[PDB]
Amino acid sequence: NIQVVVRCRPFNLAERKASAHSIVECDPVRKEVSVRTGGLADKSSRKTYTFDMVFGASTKQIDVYRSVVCPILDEVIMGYNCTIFAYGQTGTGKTFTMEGERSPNEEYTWEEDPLAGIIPRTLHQIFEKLTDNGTEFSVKVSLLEIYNEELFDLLNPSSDVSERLQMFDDPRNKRGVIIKGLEEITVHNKDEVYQILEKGAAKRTTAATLMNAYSSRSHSVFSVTIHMKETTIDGEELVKIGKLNLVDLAGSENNINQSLLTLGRVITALVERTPHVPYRESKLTRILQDSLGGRTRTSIIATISPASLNLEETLSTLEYAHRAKNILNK
Ligand SMILES: Nc1ncnc2c1ncn2[C@@H]1O[C@H](COP(=O)(O)OP(=O)(O)O)[C@@H](O)[C@H]1O
Ligand SMILES: CC(=O)N1N=C(c2ccccc2Cl)C[C@H]1c1cccc(O)c1
Ligand SMILES: [Mg+2]
Structure with a gap:
C-alpha cells in the first residue's frame, strides 16, 4: 500500500x-x-x-x-x-x-x-x-x-538554533504529539516563499557550525498546511484542511541515530505484522507515526548512487525500500 520509488x-x-x-x-x-x-x-x-x-x-x-x-x-x-x-x-x-x-x-x-x-x-x-x-x-x-x-526550529527568526523545543503527548487526539513553541509561518503569497526558504537555509548554516555533520546526521520535517474554504461555481463551500510533510531523512549509511534506528524497527514490525510497533522509541517516529501505518498517504523516495564504490550501501537502501512496500496504512 505505501508507495515506494527509486531515484x-x-x-x-x-x-x-x-x-x-x-x-x-x-x-x-x-x-x-x-x-x-x-x-x-x-x-x-x-x-x-x-x-x-x-x-x-x-x-x-x-x-x-x-x-x-x-x-x-x-x-x-x-x-x-x-x-x-x-x-x-x-x-x-x-x-x-x-x-x-x-x-x-x-x-x-x-x-x-x-x-x-x-x-x-x-x-x-x-x-x-x-x-x-x-x-x-x-x-x-x-x-x-x-x-x-533534540528538536530544532529552523524557521523562527527570533531564537537561535541552540534552543531545543520540547515535545509532549497530545491529550486530545491519541498517537499525536505537541511540539512546544514550534513556529508556523504563514505564507501570504508565492512571492513570499523564497525568502522564507532563504531564512531556513541561513539558520541551517549556523546549525551546521554548531552540530557535527549536521546535514548528514539530521532529519528535517518541512510541513505545509493548507486551510481551504472552496466555493463552487454554484454556491457550496468546502472547508478542507490538508497537510503535507516532506521529510529529508538522515543519511542511511553505516555515534547512533536513535530516530533512524527506530524508523527501521517500526517498518519491520509493520510489515512483519507484529502487534507492538516501537513508535515511542524515538522523536521522529512519534512525530510521524500517522505516516507509518496510520491514516496518512505516504511515499518513500529512495535515492541511490550509480558508482560501484557504493554497491554495499546501494544494496542496503534498495533492500530497505523494498520491504517498506509491504507496509499498509489508512
Ligand atoms: N538527480 C540529480 N541530478 C543532478 N545532480 C544530482 C542529483 N542527485 C544528486 N546530485 C548531486 O549529488 C550531490 C549529492 O547531493 P545531495 O542532494 O546533497 O545528497 P544527499 O542529500 O543524499 O546527501 C550534489 O552535489 C548534487 O548536486
Ligand atoms: C537554493 C536555496 O536557497 N534553496 N533553499 C531551499 C530550502 C531551504 C530550507 C528548507 C526548505 C528548502 Cl526547499 C531550497 C532551495 C531552492 C528554492 C527555490 C528554487 C530553487 O531552485 C532552489
Ligand atoms: Mg543532504
Whole structure:
C-alpha cells in the first residue's frame, strides 16, 4: 500500500573523468532497478528489484514532480494528510530531490529554476492551483529538524538554533504529539516563499557550525498546511484542511541515530505484522507515526548512487525500500 520509488543520480564531474562504469540499470517502463553485484559487463551476476516507480539518472526535477508530487498534492488539496520520505546514503540525492538547488550565475528566478526540488515547486503550485479557481485559503509552513534526539526550529527568526523545543503527548487526539513553541509561518503569497526558504537555509548554516555533520546526521520535517474554504461555481463551500510533510531523512549509511534506528524497527514490525510497533522509541517516529501505518498517504523516495564504490550501501537502501512496500496504512 505505501508507495515506494527509486531515484538514481547521475555521475558527477569527478566520476566522469575517471571513466565510471555504472553498476546500476533502471527500467521505468518495467518499474525495475538492476544492480551488478559480481562485476564485469562481459559476464556478471546481478540483483533485481521492482518498485511502484523507478527513475534513472536522466530524470530531471520536473519529471519527479509531475510523476510523484503532483498527484499527492492534489490529494492534500482534497483535505488529506500526505507525507513523502527521502531515504538513502549521504551523497545520493535526498536533499536534491526534496529541496533542489539553484542554477549557477543567477540564470533563473527561483520559480523557474529547473534544478528546484519538491518543496519550492509545491509551495509555488499551491498558489498556482487554489488562486485560479475560487478558493479562500491560508498557507502555513514549518521546518522541524531532529539532531541527536533534540528538536530544532529552523524557521523562527527570533531564537537561535541552540534552543531545543520540547515535545509532549497530545491529550486530545491519541498517537499525536505537541511540539512546544514550534513556529508556523504563514505564507501570504508565492512571492513570499523564497525568502522564507532563504531564512531556513541561513539558520541551517549556523546549525551546521554548531552540530557535527549536521546535514548528514539530521532529519528535517518541512510541513505545509493548507486551510481551504472552496466555493463552487454554484454556491457550496468546502472547508478542507490538508497537510503535507516532506521529510529529508538522515543519511542511511553505516555515534547512533536513535530516530533512524527506530524508523527501521517500526517498518519491520509493520510489515512483519507484529502487534507492538516501537513508535515511542524515538522523536521522529512519534512525530510521524500517522505516516507509518496510520491514516496518512505516504511515499518513500529512495535515492541511490550509480558508482560501484557504493554497491554495499546501494544494496542496503534498495533492500530497505523494498520491504517498506509491504507496509499498509489508512
Ligand atoms: N538527480 C540529480 N541530478 C543532478 N545532480 C544530482 C542529483 N542527485 C544528486 N546530485 C548531486 O549529488 C550531490 C549529492 O547531493 P545531495 O542532494 O546533497 O545528497 P544527499 O542529500 O543524499 O546527501 C550534489 O552535489 C548534487 O548536486
Ligand atoms: C537554493 C536555496 O536557497 N534553496 N533553499 C531551499 C530550502 C531551504 C530550507 C528548507 C526548505 C528548502 Cl526547499 C531550497 C532551495 C531552492 C528554492 C527555490 C528554487 C530553487 O531552485 C532552489
Ligand atoms: Mg543532504
